[PDB]
Amino acid sequence: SDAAVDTSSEITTKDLKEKKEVVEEAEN
């Protein structure tokens, strides 16, 4: 799974962080 770093090229591995952060918006 670590190799996923190469995939990081599409810029998303980090997005997972934002996607988790937005979860707060769950409050609509």
Side-chain angles (χ1 to χ4, degrees), residues 2-24:
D2 179 354
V5 46
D6 288 292
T7 298
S8 98
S9 211
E10 232 286 79
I11 308 298
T12 352
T13 339
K14 51 159 274 252
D15 291 48
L16 172 142
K17 303 235 164 71
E18 185 169 310
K19 225 170 161 46
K20 216 82 175 52
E21 177 239 48
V22 290
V23 81
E24 258 270 78

